[PDB]
Amino acid sequence: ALKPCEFPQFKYGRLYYEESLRPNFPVSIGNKYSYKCDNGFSPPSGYSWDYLRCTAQGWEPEVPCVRKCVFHYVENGDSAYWEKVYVQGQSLKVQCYNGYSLQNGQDTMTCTENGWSPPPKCI
């Protein structure tokens, strides 16, 4: 069987069980391995862990761990009741109060490589 996927090493995270598994590589298309990301980062799905999949295009995702932005508290705005995870590239509309705003027309925040932009502070 073809074994085209080498031991996956990527930024801001790692496979679980890296030492029981590293010698098993390379592996075949269809195999998958659980992984986690560093604090402040997340799989694109926004879950606490996810699968790295050996595909015909190599490992997917290409960038397994991306910036994580948590939505919860908004100063002078509407806060949520529990922490909602967002990932790099996602955006939401924040509800500001009493003539305060995020100063970007639509009161939208985007999860960027360096966190929320602008921050969840209505001014």
UniProtKB/Swiss-Prot annotation:
Quaternary structure annotation from Swiss-Prot or TrEMBL: Homodimer. Also forms homooligomers. Interacts with complement protein C3b; this interaction inhibits complement activation. Interacts with complement protein C3d. Interacts with CR3/ITGAM; this interaction mediates adhesion of neutrophils to pathogens leading to pathogen clearance.
Q: Which residues of the full protein are shown?
A: 321 to 443 of 1234
Which residues form each disulfide bond in the chain?
C5-C54, C37-C65, C69-C111, C96-C122
Ranked from the top, the taxonomy reads:
Eukaryota, Metazoa, Chordata, Craniata, Vertebrata
Following inactivation of the gene, the phenotype reported is: The lack of CFH alters the microarchitecture of bone and affects osteoblast and osteoclast dynamics.
Domain free text: Sushi 1-3 domain represents the minimal unit capable of cofactor activity. The property to discriminate self surfaces from non-self surfaces depends on the C-terminal region made of Sushis 19-20.
The protein here is known as: Complement factor H
The task this protein performs is described as: Glycoprotein that plays an essential role in maintaining a well-balanced immune response by modulating complement activation. Acts as a soluble inhibitor of complement, where its binding to self markers such as glycan structures prevents complement activation and amplification on cell surfaces. Accelerates the decay of the complement alternative pathway (AP) C3 convertase C3bBb, thus preventing local formation of more C3b, the central player of the complement amplification loop. As a cofactor of the serine protease factor I, CFH also regulates proteolytic degradation of already-deposited C3b.
Tissue localization of expression: CFH is one of the most abundant complement components in blood where the liver is the major source of CFH protein in vivo. in addition, CFH is secreted by additional cell types including monocytes, fibroblasts, or endothelial cells.
Gene (name only):
Cfh
- Describe how it is modified after translation: Sulfated on tyrosine residues.
**Boundaries of every Sushi domain copy:** 4-66, 67-123
The listed locations are: Secreted
